């Protein structure tokens, strides 16, 4: 929604635990204010999949809506001489980090959110693999999203789904099969999804479909310089609510529209809806869908 990209589905919380100095503008993200964990996602060019589904949830939003669980540990001490459990996963990802970030976050192989973190006064290097003393006067307050992805709630069981890629010996940290022969190696942009009770599923092809609907997250509302408005205060047709609302024809097909007396205006959010993905011939409803650039090894 051209003007409502900051009118977030769900709670709209774009912070990472332990970095709460940006909560005024990140918890929630809304029309006013800058949020270092979220604004980078709307820079055109970057995150083209998320911008195609920008009314779906971010990774941090999904975590705070309890759609995606936090990894344990939730953050990896990058500088630590003893190593850390993210290191292997991070090193197979080719990523670019702007300066002044102390933290960056990603969906790990378990389908949980992990993060790499520097000590205070240190920033992530441009490949996000090391920490160095900060180059600026101050660090950003949030965490850089390392993957181009979007999320949604889902109860579709994915326990049986696994990565299937033709002629791939290894993708990311996943060994699909041992290859006796000479292999080629490349950094490739690979689509992936995570499902309920599944690990990360890499795919040869991204095939998605959206069913539009009239559920609450399919709308954005604002006071009638925008101020957002919580649609749960709007009465359904024939129902009760704490405020009076109006909106477009889609909204008024489901909610009672009061026109003159309205406190708010509600618009259907462009591109919102139930997303499904085709995985090895079968359509499933994922929790998150994304791209990431990882090392892929293929039989020659």
């Amino acid at each position, epitope marked *: 929604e051209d003007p409502h990209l900051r009118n977030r589905p769900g709670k709209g919380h774009n912070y990472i635990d332990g970095m709460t*100095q*940006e909560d*005024a*503008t990140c918890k929630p993200v809304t029309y006013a204010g800058a949020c270092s964990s979220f604004d980078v996602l709307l820079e055109k060019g970057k995150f083209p999949l998320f911008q195609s589904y920008a009314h779906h949830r971010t990774l941090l939003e999904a975590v705070h809506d309890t759609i995606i669980a936090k990894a344990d540990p939730p953050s990896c001490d990058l500088q630590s001489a003893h190593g850390n459990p993210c290191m292997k996963e991070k090193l197979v990802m080719k990523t670019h980090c702007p300066n002044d970030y102390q933290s960056a976050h990603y969906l790990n192989n378990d389908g949980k959110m992990a993060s790499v973190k520097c000590p205070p006064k240190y920033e992530l290097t441009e490949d996000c693999n090391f920490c160095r003393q900060m180059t600026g006067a*101050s660090l950003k307050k949030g965490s850089y999203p390392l993957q181009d992805l979007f999320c949604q709630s889902s109860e579709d069981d994915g326990s049986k789904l696994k990565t299937k890629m033709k002629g791939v010996c290894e993708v990311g940290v996943q060994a699909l099969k041992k290859c006796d022969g000479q292999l080629s190696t490349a950094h490739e942009v690979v689509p992936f999804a995570v499902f309920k009770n599944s690990k990360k599923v890499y795919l040869d092809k991204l095939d998605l479909k959206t069913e539009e609907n009239l559920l609450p997250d399919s709308f954005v509302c604002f006071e009638h310089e925008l101020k957002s408005f919580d649609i749960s205060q709007c009465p359904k047709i024939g129902g009760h609510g704490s405020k009076k609302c109006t909106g477009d024809a889609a909204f008024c097909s489901a909610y009672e529209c009061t026109a003159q007396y309205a406190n708010a205006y509600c618009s259907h959010a462009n591109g919102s809806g139930i997303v499904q993905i085709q995985v090895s011939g079968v359509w499933k409803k994922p929790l998150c869908v994304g791209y990431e650039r990882v090392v892929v090894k293929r039989e020659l």
Partner: antibody
């Protein structure tokens, strides 16, 4: 805009439980993402945070006091309350309820701080 | 839990500038936090003056004169309140405050006397 008003006994006996209530008018303690707090100040001394609620759903306490302190909420009456157990002469203080801003990027929530006038509590037999 | 140390008293003359310090303990870093400053005059609750995170992320309290400003000293791990063009009405107690996750931490406060 928002106004806060403390209510309570003024006198409590040693080892008893101090109970106080804050009534909020002009805004709702149940939405907006605001923090609603208890803070005390012994006359002639500093400020000590006791605990707060975030909207009406989560509660966090000063760790040095947590074992003696409960905060509860009455969303229907727009009130929150404090219970401090095992009181000693060291608990004699002026007890404020307050909502203080958190800020980032020039945006502050709330845009200004709100304080009640405070209620004086003397611990004495 | 962390202790914010403020000097118990300070003093300066009209038109001078008062510099008040708030030193964080060595295990946390001043660069990480919004620093909030509060003023308390006799008979009133404390009042929010301003917050400071960085030169590009800072704000003044509504109705608080511009002559109050905040800054940080990374090497000394201190937050600083600078009161320029000191006026008689500025005699007060000043408290610094930080807001780590799930806590409010107040400094001990500095009693500022305006001389002369």
């Amino acid at each position: 805009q928002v106004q806060l008003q403390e209510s309570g006994p003024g006198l409590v006996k040693p080892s008893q439980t101090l109970s106080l209530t804050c009534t909020v008018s002009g805004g709702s303690i149940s939405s907006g993402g605001y923090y609603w707090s208890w803070i005390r100040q012994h006359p002639g001394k500093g400020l000590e945070w006791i605990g707060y609620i975030y909207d009406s759903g989560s509660t966090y306490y000063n760790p040095s006091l947590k074992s003696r302190v409960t905060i509860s909420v009455d969303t229907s009456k727009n009130q929150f309350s404090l219970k401090l157990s095992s009181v000693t002469a060291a608990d004699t203080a002026l007890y404020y309820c307050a909502s203080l801003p958190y800020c980032s990027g020039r945006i502050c929530r709330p845009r200004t701080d709100y304080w009640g006038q405070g209620t004086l509590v003397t611990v004495s037999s | 839990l962390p202790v914010l140390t403020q000097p118990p008293s300070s003093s300066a003359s009209p038109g001078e500038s008062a510099r008040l310090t708030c030193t964080l303990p060595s295990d946390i870093n001043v660069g990480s936090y919004n620093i909030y400053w509060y003023q308390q005059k006799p008979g009133s609750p404390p009042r929010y003056l301003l917050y400071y995170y960085s030169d590009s992320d800072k704000g003044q309290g509504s109705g608080v004169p511009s002559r109050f400003s905040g800054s940080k000293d990374a090497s000394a791990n201190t937050g600083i309140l600078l009161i320029s063009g000191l006026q008689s009405e500025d005699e007060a107690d000043y408290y610094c405050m930080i807001w780590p996750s799930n806590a409010w931490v107040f400094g001990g406060g500095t009693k500022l006397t305006v001389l002369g």
